[PDB]
Amino acid sequence: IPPIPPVDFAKYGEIEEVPMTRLMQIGATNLHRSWLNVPHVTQFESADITELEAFRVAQKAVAEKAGVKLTVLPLLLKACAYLLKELPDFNSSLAPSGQALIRKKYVHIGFAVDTPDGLLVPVIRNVDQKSLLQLAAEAAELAEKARSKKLGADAMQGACFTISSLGHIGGTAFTPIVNAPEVAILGVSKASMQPVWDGKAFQPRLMLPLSLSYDHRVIDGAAAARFTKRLGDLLADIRAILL
Amino acid sequence: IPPIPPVDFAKYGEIEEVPMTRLMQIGATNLHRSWLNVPHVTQFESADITELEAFRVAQKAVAEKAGVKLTVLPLLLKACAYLLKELPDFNSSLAPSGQALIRKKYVHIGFAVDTPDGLLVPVIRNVDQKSLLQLAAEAAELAEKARSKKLGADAMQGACFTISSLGHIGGTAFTPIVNAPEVAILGVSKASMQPVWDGKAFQPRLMLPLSLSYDHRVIDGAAAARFTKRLGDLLADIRAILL
Protein backbone atom coordinates (compact mmCIF):
# COMPACT_ATOMS: atom_id res chain seq x y z
CA ILE A 1 0.00 0.00 0.00
CA PRO A 2 1.64 3.40 -0.81
CA PRO A 3 3.23 4.95 2.37
CA ILE A 4 2.39 8.41 3.60
CA PRO A 5 5.28 10.79 2.81
CA PRO A 6 7.16 12.07 5.93
CA VAL A 7 6.78 15.73 6.77
CA ASP A 8 9.18 17.81 8.83
CA PHE A 9 6.43 19.04 11.21
CA ALA A 10 8.76 21.35 12.96
CA LYS A 11 9.07 23.63 9.87
CA TYR A 12 5.65 24.92 10.86
CA GLY A 13 6.17 25.30 14.60
CA GLU A 14 7.18 23.71 17.85
CA ILE A 15 6.43 19.97 18.03
CA GLU A 16 6.77 17.52 20.90
CA GLU A 17 6.94 13.69 20.63
CA VAL A 18 4.92 11.58 23.02
CA PRO A 19 5.11 7.76 22.57
CA MET A 20 2.49 5.12 22.07
CA THR A 21 1.84 2.50 24.69
CA ARG A 22 2.30 -1.03 23.46
CA LEU A 23 -1.52 -1.28 23.85
CA MET A 24 -2.06 1.60 21.37
CA GLN A 25 0.35 0.00 18.95
CA ILE A 26 -1.35 -3.35 19.13
CA GLY A 27 -4.69 -1.66 18.69
CA ALA A 28 -3.40 0.33 15.72
CA THR A 29 -2.17 -2.77 14.00
CA ASN A 30 -5.32 -4.72 14.49
CA LEU A 31 -7.60 -1.92 13.29
CA HIS A 32 -5.60 -1.46 10.15
CA ARG A 33 -5.71 -5.25 9.51
CA SER A 34 -9.53 -5.26 9.81
CA TRP A 35 -9.84 -2.10 7.73
CA LEU A 36 -7.94 -3.56 4.82
CA ASN A 37 -9.58 -6.98 5.09
CA VAL A 38 -13.21 -6.21 5.68
CA PRO A 39 -15.37 -4.32 3.12
CA HIS A 40 -17.35 -2.27 5.67
CA VAL A 41 -20.95 -1.07 5.54
CA THR A 42 -22.74 0.61 8.44
CA GLN A 43 -26.50 0.29 8.81
CA PHE A 44 -28.15 2.88 10.96
CA GLU A 45 -31.44 2.49 12.93
CA SER A 46 -33.17 4.09 15.97
CA ALA A 47 -34.84 2.01 18.65
CA ASP A 48 -37.65 3.19 20.92
CA ILE A 49 -36.40 2.60 24.39
CA THR A 50 -39.02 4.74 26.29
CA GLU A 51 -40.41 1.68 27.95
CA LEU A 52 -36.99 -0.02 28.37
CA GLU A 53 -35.86 3.10 30.23
CA ALA A 54 -38.83 3.19 32.53
CA PHE A 55 -38.16 -0.50 33.35
CA ARG A 56 -34.46 0.20 33.95
CA VAL A 57 -35.13 3.06 36.30
CA ALA A 58 -37.91 1.16 38.19
CA GLN A 59 -35.57 -1.78 38.92
CA LYS A 60 -33.04 0.64 40.54
CA ALA A 61 -34.16 -0.71 43.92
CA VAL A 62 -33.60 -4.39 43.09
CA ALA A 63 -30.31 -3.62 41.30
CA GLU A 64 -29.03 -1.71 44.36
CA LYS A 65 -30.02 -4.61 46.71
CA ALA A 66 -27.98 -6.96 44.46
CA GLY A 67 -25.01 -4.55 44.37
CA VAL A 68 -25.15 -3.95 40.59
CA LYS A 69 -26.05 -0.93 38.57
CA LEU A 70 -28.56 -1.65 35.88
CA THR A 71 -27.38 0.26 32.78
CA VAL A 72 -28.60 -0.14 29.12
CA LEU A 73 -25.64 -2.46 28.42
CA PRO A 74 -27.00 -5.73 30.04
CA LEU A 75 -30.25 -5.00 28.23
CA LEU A 76 -28.32 -4.55 24.96
CA LEU A 77 -26.30 -7.70 25.60
CA LYS A 78 -29.36 -9.86 26.37
CA ALA A 79 -31.27 -8.67 23.28
CA CYS A 80 -28.24 -9.16 20.97
CA ALA A 81 -27.57 -12.73 22.34
CA TYR A 82 -31.14 -13.58 21.48
CA LEU A 83 -30.80 -12.13 17.99
CA LEU A 84 -27.40 -13.78 17.45
CA LYS A 85 -29.17 -17.11 17.95
CA GLU A 86 -32.05 -16.11 15.61
CA LEU A 87 -29.90 -14.79 12.76
CA PRO A 88 -26.83 -17.14 12.94
CA ASP A 89 -24.90 -15.62 10.03
CA PHE A 90 -24.07 -12.79 12.45
CA ASN A 91 -22.65 -15.29 14.92
CA SER A 92 -20.10 -16.75 12.54
CA SER A 93 -16.70 -16.12 10.93
CA LEU A 94 -15.19 -16.45 7.49
CA ALA A 95 -13.16 -19.59 7.45
CA PRO A 96 -9.52 -19.15 6.25
CA SER A 97 -10.34 -21.02 3.00
CA GLY A 98 -12.61 -18.03 2.00
CA GLN A 99 -15.23 -20.62 0.99
CA ALA A 100 -16.87 -21.47 4.28
CA LEU A 101 -18.38 -19.79 7.25
CA ILE A 102 -17.81 -21.14 10.65
CA ARG A 103 -21.04 -20.83 12.58
CA LYS A 104 -20.44 -20.68 16.24
CA LYS A 105 -23.06 -22.44 18.40
CA TYR A 106 -22.10 -20.39 21.49
CA VAL A 107 -22.76 -16.64 22.15
CA HIS A 108 -19.90 -14.74 23.82
CA ILE A 109 -19.97 -10.95 23.38
CA GLY A 110 -17.22 -8.35 23.93
CA PHE A 111 -17.82 -4.75 24.90
CA ALA A 112 -15.43 -1.90 24.43
CA VAL A 113 -13.83 -0.27 27.44
CA ASP A 114 -11.68 2.79 26.90
CA THR A 115 -8.88 2.78 29.43
CA PRO A 116 -5.84 5.14 29.86
CA ASP A 117 -3.61 2.73 28.14
CA GLY A 118 -5.82 2.09 25.15
CA LEU A 119 -8.89 0.12 24.21
CA LEU A 120 -9.69 -3.26 25.73
CA VAL A 121 -12.65 -5.42 24.76
CA PRO A 122 -13.42 -7.77 27.66
CA VAL A 123 -15.65 -10.73 26.65
CA ILE A 124 -18.69 -12.09 28.55
CA ARG A 125 -19.14 -15.77 27.87
CA ASN A 126 -22.53 -17.35 27.22
CA VAL A 127 -24.48 -14.11 27.34
CA ASP A 128 -27.48 -16.10 26.19
CA GLN A 129 -27.56 -17.92 29.57
CA LYS A 130 -27.19 -15.11 32.02
CA SER A 131 -29.78 -12.85 33.52
CA LEU A 132 -29.87 -9.10 33.42
CA LEU A 133 -28.39 -8.76 36.91
CA GLN A 134 -25.74 -11.42 36.27
CA LEU A 135 -24.66 -9.58 33.17
CA ALA A 136 -24.78 -6.18 34.99
CA ALA A 137 -22.49 -7.57 37.66
CA GLU A 138 -20.01 -9.22 35.35
CA ALA A 139 -19.84 -6.28 32.90
CA ALA A 140 -18.81 -4.01 35.76
CA GLU A 141 -16.21 -6.40 37.13
CA LEU A 142 -14.57 -6.92 33.76
CA ALA A 143 -14.67 -3.15 33.27
CA GLU A 144 -12.95 -2.43 36.61
CA LYS A 145 -10.26 -5.09 35.95
CA ALA A 146 -9.76 -3.61 32.49
CA ARG A 147 -9.15 -0.10 33.90
CA SER A 148 -6.92 -1.56 36.51
CA LYS A 149 -4.83 -3.65 34.04
CA LYS A 150 -5.86 -6.72 36.04
CA LEU A 151 -7.69 -8.19 33.05
CA GLY A 152 -6.02 -11.43 31.98
CA ALA A 153 -5.68 -12.08 28.19
CA ASP A 154 -7.92 -15.11 28.51
CA ALA A 155 -10.92 -12.81 29.10
CA MET A 156 -10.21 -11.04 25.84
CA GLN A 157 -10.78 -14.06 23.60
CA GLY A 158 -13.31 -15.90 21.55
CA ALA A 159 -15.99 -13.27 21.27
CA CYS A 160 -18.57 -13.56 18.55
CA PHE A 161 -19.78 -9.92 18.34
CA THR A 162 -18.84 -6.57 19.94
CA ILE A 163 -20.97 -3.75 21.35
CA SER A 164 -19.31 -0.29 21.51
CA SER A 165 -21.36 2.12 23.59
CA LEU A 166 -20.57 5.82 23.47
CA GLY A 167 -24.07 6.84 24.62
CA HIS A 168 -22.61 8.17 27.85
CA ILE A 169 -20.50 10.83 26.08
CA GLY A 170 -22.66 11.94 23.23
CA GLY A 171 -23.17 11.81 19.54
CA THR A 172 -25.74 10.91 17.07
CA ALA A 173 -24.17 7.83 15.38
CA PHE A 174 -20.75 6.71 14.21
CA THR A 175 -19.35 4.00 11.92
CA PRO A 176 -17.45 1.45 14.11
CA ILE A 177 -14.79 -0.93 12.72
CA VAL A 178 -15.41 -4.62 12.74
CA ASN A 179 -13.05 -6.56 14.95
CA ALA A 180 -12.11 -9.29 12.48
CA PRO A 181 -12.44 -12.27 12.64
CA GLU A 182 -15.93 -11.30 13.94
CA VAL A 183 -18.37 -10.26 11.24
CA ALA A 184 -20.30 -7.37 12.90
CA ILE A 185 -20.13 -4.71 15.77
CA LEU A 186 -23.03 -2.65 17.27
CA GLY A 187 -22.26 0.97 18.02
CA VAL A 188 -24.71 2.68 20.39
CA SER A 189 -24.88 6.46 20.78
CA LYS A 190 -26.75 8.98 22.95
CA ALA A 191 -30.49 8.65 23.41
CA SER A 192 -32.67 11.68 22.72
CA MET A 193 -36.31 12.54 22.97
CA GLN A 194 -37.61 12.59 19.44
CA PRO A 195 -41.01 13.26 17.88
CA VAL A 196 -42.39 10.11 16.46
CA TRP A 197 -45.57 10.16 14.41
CA ASP A 198 -48.32 8.08 15.99
CA GLY A 199 -50.51 8.18 12.87
CA LYS A 200 -52.12 11.47 13.99
CA ALA A 201 -49.60 13.69 15.84
CA PHE A 202 -46.03 13.56 16.98
CA GLN A 203 -45.43 11.82 20.28
CA PRO A 204 -42.11 12.26 22.18
CA ARG A 205 -40.37 8.96 22.38
CA LEU A 206 -36.87 8.25 23.73
CA MET A 207 -34.91 7.05 20.77
CA LEU A 208 -31.53 5.20 20.98
CA PRO A 209 -29.32 5.43 17.82
CA LEU A 210 -27.81 2.13 16.69
CA SER A 211 -25.01 1.87 14.10
CA LEU A 212 -24.25 -1.71 12.98
CA SER A 213 -21.10 -2.01 10.85
CA TYR A 214 -20.71 -5.43 9.12
CA ASP A 215 -18.49 -7.50 6.95
CA HIS A 216 -20.25 -7.21 3.65
CA ARG A 217 -18.57 -10.40 2.32
CA VAL A 218 -20.51 -12.43 4.81
CA ILE A 219 -23.55 -10.18 5.49
CA ASP A 220 -25.61 -8.56 2.75
CA GLY A 221 -27.63 -5.42 3.04
CA ALA A 222 -31.00 -6.99 3.60
CA ALA A 223 -29.74 -9.25 6.38
CA ALA A 224 -28.22 -6.32 8.23
CA ALA A 225 -31.37 -4.14 7.84
CA ARG A 226 -33.37 -7.07 9.16
CA PHE A 227 -30.97 -7.37 12.13
CA THR A 228 -31.19 -3.73 13.27
CA LYS A 229 -34.98 -3.80 12.70
CA ARG A 230 -35.45 -6.92 14.91
CA LEU A 231 -33.18 -5.30 17.48
CA GLY A 232 -35.25 -2.10 17.38
CA ASP A 233 -38.30 -4.33 17.90
CA LEU A 234 -36.74 -6.23 20.79
CA LEU A 235 -35.66 -3.05 22.62
CA ALA A 236 -39.06 -1.47 22.15
CA ASP A 237 -40.51 -4.51 24.03
CA ILE A 238 -37.93 -6.78 25.83
CA ARG A 239 -40.73 -9.20 26.71
CA ALA A 240 -40.51 -10.60 23.17
CA ILE A 241 -37.31 -12.27 24.37
CA LEU A 242 -39.52 -14.43 26.64
CA LEU A 243 -41.35 -15.97 23.77
CA ILE B 1 -65.13 -40.48 60.64
CA PRO B 2 -68.94 -40.70 61.25
CA PRO B 3 -70.78 -41.88 58.05
CA ILE B 4 -73.60 -39.94 56.47
CA PRO B 5 -76.93 -41.69 57.23
CA PRO B 6 -78.62 -43.24 54.13
CA VAL B 7 -81.83 -41.63 52.95
CA ASP B 8 -84.53 -43.27 50.86
CA PHE B 9 -84.51 -40.48 48.23
CA ALA B 10 -87.42 -41.95 46.43
CA LYS B 11 -89.82 -41.13 49.32
CA TYR B 12 -89.70 -37.58 48.03
CA GLY B 13 -90.03 -38.25 44.31
CA GLU B 14 -88.73 -40.04 41.27
CA ILE B 15 -84.98 -40.72 41.37
CA GLU B 16 -82.67 -42.18 38.74
CA GLU B 17 -79.20 -43.70 39.34
CA VAL B 18 -76.35 -42.81 37.04
CA PRO B 19 -72.90 -44.33 37.82
CA MET B 20 -69.52 -42.82 38.39
CA THR B 21 -66.69 -43.39 35.97
CA ARG B 22 -63.66 -45.00 37.53
CA LEU B 23 -62.00 -41.58 36.93
CA MET B 24 -64.61 -39.82 39.13
CA GLN B 25 -64.15 -42.43 41.81
CA ILE B 26 -60.42 -42.09 41.82
CA GLY B 27 -60.77 -38.33 41.92
CA ALA B 28 -63.27 -38.55 44.77
CA THR B 29 -60.95 -40.68 46.83
CA ASN B 30 -57.94 -38.51 46.32
CA LEU B 31 -59.77 -35.28 47.14
CA HIS B 32 -61.11 -36.69 50.34
CA ARG B 33 -57.61 -37.91 51.30
CA SER B 34 -56.17 -34.40 50.78
CA TRP B 35 -59.10 -32.79 52.56
CA LEU B 36 -58.62 -34.82 55.69
CA ASN B 37 -54.82 -34.57 55.62
CA VAL B 38 -54.16 -30.98 54.75
CA PRO B 39 -55.27 -28.06 57.01
CA HIS B 40 -56.29 -25.70 54.18
CA VAL B 41 -56.08 -21.92 54.00
CA THR B 42 -56.81 -19.89 50.86
CA GLN B 43 -55.10 -16.56 50.31
CA PHE B 44 -56.77 -14.26 47.84
CA GLU B 45 -55.08 -11.53 45.73
CA SER B 46 -55.75 -9.60 42.47
CA ALA B 47 -53.04 -9.03 39.89
CA ASP B 48 -52.97 -6.19 37.37
CA ILE B 49 -52.68 -7.87 34.03
CA THR B 50 -53.59 -4.81 31.81
CA GLU B 51 -50.14 -4.79 30.34
CA LEU B 52 -49.80 -8.61 30.27
CA GLU B 53 -53.00 -8.69 28.21
CA ALA B 54 -51.86 -6.09 25.75
CA PHE B 55 -48.63 -8.12 25.28
CA ARG B 56 -50.62 -11.36 24.84
CA VAL B 57 -52.88 -9.89 22.22
CA ALA B 58 -49.98 -8.17 20.35
CA GLN B 59 -48.08 -11.48 20.01
CA LYS B 60 -51.17 -13.08 18.34
CA ALA B 61 -49.30 -12.82 15.03
CA VAL B 62 -46.14 -14.60 16.19
CA ALA B 63 -48.17 -17.23 18.10
CA GLU B 64 -50.24 -17.98 14.97
CA LYS B 65 -47.05 -18.32 12.83
CA ALA B 66 -45.76 -20.87 15.38
CA GLY B 67 -49.09 -22.74 15.44
CA VAL B 68 -49.82 -22.06 19.14
CA LYS B 69 -52.40 -19.97 20.84
CA LEU B 70 -50.96 -17.66 23.42
CA THR B 71 -53.35 -17.80 26.42
CA VAL B 72 -52.74 -16.50 30.02
CA LEU B 73 -51.72 -20.03 31.09
CA PRO B 74 -48.10 -20.09 29.68
CA LEU B 75 -47.68 -16.66 31.23
CA LEU B 76 -49.00 -18.01 34.55
CA LEU B 77 -46.78 -21.08 34.31
CA LYS B 78 -43.60 -19.10 33.54
CA ALA B 79 -44.19 -16.63 36.40
CA CYS B 80 -44.99 -19.42 38.92
CA ALA B 81 -41.84 -21.46 37.91
CA TYR B 82 -39.79 -18.38 38.62
CA LEU B 83 -41.46 -17.87 41.99
CA LEU B 84 -41.21 -21.58 42.87
CA LYS B 85 -37.44 -21.19 42.55
CA GLU B 86 -37.44 -17.96 44.62
CA LEU B 87 -39.63 -19.22 47.47
CA PRO B 88 -38.57 -22.94 47.67
CA ASP B 89 -40.87 -23.93 50.55
CA PHE B 90 -43.65 -23.88 47.94
CA ASN B 91 -41.72 -26.31 45.79
CA SER B 92 -41.44 -29.01 48.43
CA SER B 93 -43.38 -31.79 50.17
CA LEU B 94 -43.83 -33.03 53.71
CA ALA B 95 -41.67 -36.04 54.13
CA PRO B 96 -43.49 -39.16 55.50
CA SER B 97 -41.65 -38.80 58.85
CA GLY B 98 -43.63 -35.52 59.46
CA GLN B 99 -40.33 -33.95 60.53
CA ALA B 100 -38.74 -33.02 57.23
CA LEU B 101 -39.56 -31.26 54.05
CA ILE B 102 -38.33 -32.57 50.81
CA ARG B 103 -37.31 -29.63 48.68
CA LYS B 104 -37.46 -30.45 45.06
CA LYS B 105 -34.73 -28.84 42.91
CA TYR B 106 -36.81 -29.25 39.72
CA VAL B 107 -40.00 -27.33 38.71
CA HIS B 108 -42.72 -29.43 37.05
CA ILE B 109 -46.24 -27.95 37.16
CA GLY B 110 -49.63 -29.60 36.55
CA PHE B 111 -52.70 -27.81 35.24
CA ALA B 112 -56.25 -28.95 35.60
CA VAL B 113 -58.18 -30.10 32.56
CA ASP B 114 -61.84 -30.94 32.96
CA THR B 115 -62.72 -33.76 30.61
CA PRO B 116 -66.01 -35.75 30.16
CA ASP B 117 -64.69 -38.55 32.20
CA GLY B 118 -63.46 -36.48 35.11
CA LEU B 119 -60.55 -34.27 36.02
CA LEU B 120 -57.03 -34.88 34.76
CA VAL B 121 -53.99 -32.85 35.74
CA PRO B 122 -51.36 -33.23 33.01
CA VAL B 123 -47.84 -32.16 34.14
CA ILE B 124 -45.36 -29.99 32.18
CA ARG B 125 -41.82 -30.86 33.16
CA ASN B 126 -39.14 -28.23 33.74
CA VAL B 127 -41.41 -25.26 33.23
CA ASP B 128 -38.52 -23.10 34.36
CA GLN B 129 -36.61 -23.97 31.16
CA LYS B 130 -39.21 -23.51 28.50
CA SER B 131 -40.27 -20.41 26.67
CA LEU B 132 -43.71 -18.95 26.44
CA LEU B 133 -44.38 -20.50 23.02
CA GLN B 134 -42.92 -23.87 24.04
CA LEU B 135 -45.21 -23.93 27.03
CA ALA B 136 -48.21 -22.75 24.92
CA ALA B 137 -47.61 -25.61 22.52
CA GLU B 138 -47.13 -28.31 25.10
CA ALA B 139 -50.06 -27.18 27.30
CA ALA B 140 -52.38 -27.56 24.32
CA GLU B 141 -51.05 -30.96 23.31
CA LEU B 142 -51.37 -32.38 26.80
CA ALA B 143 -54.85 -30.87 26.96
CA GLU B 144 -55.96 -32.49 23.68
CA LYS B 145 -54.53 -35.90 24.72
CA ALA B 146 -56.29 -35.53 28.06
CA ARG B 147 -59.68 -34.94 26.39
CA SER B 148 -59.01 -37.76 24.05
CA LYS B 149 -57.98 -40.24 26.81
CA LYS B 150 -54.64 -40.58 25.03
CA LEU B 151 -52.77 -39.16 28.02
CA GLY B 152 -50.45 -41.79 29.45
CA ALA B 153 -50.19 -42.03 33.31
CA ASP B 154 -46.53 -41.08 33.11
CA ALA B 155 -47.52 -37.51 32.16
CA MET B 156 -49.62 -37.24 35.29
CA GLN B 157 -46.74 -37.63 37.74
CA GLY B 158 -44.22 -35.77 39.79
CA ALA B 159 -45.67 -32.30 39.68
CA CYS B 160 -44.62 -29.78 42.27
CA PHE B 161 -47.56 -27.32 42.09
CA THR B 162 -50.92 -27.11 40.27
CA ILE B 163 -52.67 -24.22 38.50
CA SER B 164 -56.48 -24.53 38.14
CA SER B 165 -57.84 -21.91 35.75
CA LEU B 166 -61.57 -21.30 35.60
CA GLY B 167 -61.15 -17.78 34.16
CA HIS B 168 -62.74 -18.92 30.92
CA ILE B 169 -66.09 -19.76 32.58
CA GLY B 170 -66.48 -17.11 35.19
CA GLY B 171 -66.39 -16.37 38.84
CA THR B 172 -64.75 -14.10 41.23
CA ALA B 173 -62.58 -16.53 43.26
CA PHE B 174 -62.86 -20.02 44.72
CA THR B 175 -61.01 -22.10 47.31
CA PRO B 176 -59.21 -24.98 45.46
CA ILE B 177 -58.07 -28.19 47.21
CA VAL B 178 -54.41 -28.96 47.47
CA ASN B 179 -53.36 -32.05 45.57
CA ALA B 180 -51.32 -33.70 48.32
CA PRO B 181 -48.42 -34.49 48.39
CA GLU B 182 -47.95 -31.02 46.81
CA VAL B 183 -48.18 -28.14 49.27
CA ALA B 184 -50.05 -25.44 47.25
CA ILE B 185 -52.42 -24.88 44.18
CA LEU B 186 -53.16 -21.57 42.35
CA GLY B 187 -56.77 -21.03 41.33
CA VAL B 188 -57.30 -18.34 38.69
CA SER B 189 -60.73 -16.84 37.96
CA LYS B 190 -62.25 -14.37 35.48
CA ALA B 191 -60.53 -11.06 34.83
CA SER B 192 -62.57 -7.88 35.14
CA MET B 193 -62.01 -4.21 34.60
CA GLN B 194 -61.78 -2.69 38.03
CA PRO B 195 -61.24 0.84 39.33
CA VAL B 196 -57.90 1.10 40.93
CA TRP B 197 -56.88 4.24 42.77
CA ASP B 198 -53.85 5.91 41.23
CA GLY B 199 -53.31 8.24 44.19
CA LYS B 200 -55.71 10.83 42.70
CA ALA B 201 -58.59 9.15 40.82
CA PHE B 202 -59.72 5.69 39.90
CA GLN B 203 -58.13 4.22 36.81
CA PRO B 204 -59.66 1.14 35.08
CA ARG B 205 -57.23 -1.70 35.26
CA LEU B 206 -57.78 -5.32 34.18
CA MET B 207 -57.56 -7.32 37.34
CA LEU B 208 -57.09 -11.15 37.48
CA PRO B 209 -58.31 -12.83 40.74
CA LEU B 210 -55.87 -15.35 42.23
CA SER B 211 -56.81 -17.82 45.00
CA LEU B 212 -53.84 -19.72 46.46
CA SER B 213 -54.84 -22.57 48.79
CA TYR B 214 -51.91 -24.03 50.83
CA ASP B 215 -50.94 -26.66 53.29
CA HIS B 216 -50.75 -24.64 56.45
CA ARG B 217 -48.49 -27.24 58.13
CA VAL B 218 -45.75 -26.40 55.72
CA ILE B 219 -46.67 -22.82 54.67
CA ASP B 220 -47.58 -20.08 57.14
CA GLY B 221 -49.73 -17.09 56.47
CA ALA B 222 -46.99 -14.58 55.85
CA ALA B 223 -45.19 -16.81 53.35
CA ALA B 224 -48.37 -17.32 51.35
CA ALA B 225 -49.25 -13.57 51.37
CA ARG B 226 -45.71 -12.89 50.19
CA PHE B 227 -46.15 -15.48 47.40
CA THR B 228 -49.38 -14.05 45.94
CA LYS B 229 -47.95 -10.51 46.30
CA ARG B 230 -44.76 -11.40 44.34
CA LEU B 231 -46.94 -13.14 41.77
CA GLY B 232 -49.15 -10.04 41.48
CA ASP B 233 -45.93 -8.07 40.97
CA LEU B 234 -44.58 -10.46 38.35
CA LEU B 235 -47.82 -10.46 36.33
CA ALA B 236 -48.05 -6.68 36.46
CA ASP B 237 -44.59 -6.61 34.76
CA ILE B 238 -43.33 -9.99 33.32
CA ARG B 239 -40.00 -8.34 32.49
CA ALA B 240 -38.99 -8.75 36.14
CA ILE B 241 -38.55 -12.43 35.28
CA LEU B 242 -35.60 -11.37 33.08
CA LEU B 243 -33.66 -9.98 35.95
UniProtKB/Swiss-Prot annotation, chains A, B:
The active site is at 216. Residues 1-243 are annotated as: Catalytic. It comes from the Bacteria. Forms a 24-polypeptide structural core with octahedral symmetry. The pyruvate dehydrogenase complex catalyzes the overall conversion of pyruvate to acetyl-CoA and CO(2). It contains multiple copies of three enzymatic components: pyruvate dehydrogenase (E1), dihydrolipoamide acetyltransferase (E2) and lipoamide dehydrogenase (E3). Belongs to the 2-oxoacid dehydrogenase family. This is Dihydrolipoyllysine-residue acetyltransferase component of pyruvate dehydrogenase complex. The lineage of its organism: Bacteria, Pseudomonadati, Pseudomonadota, Gammaproteobacteria, Pseudomonadales.
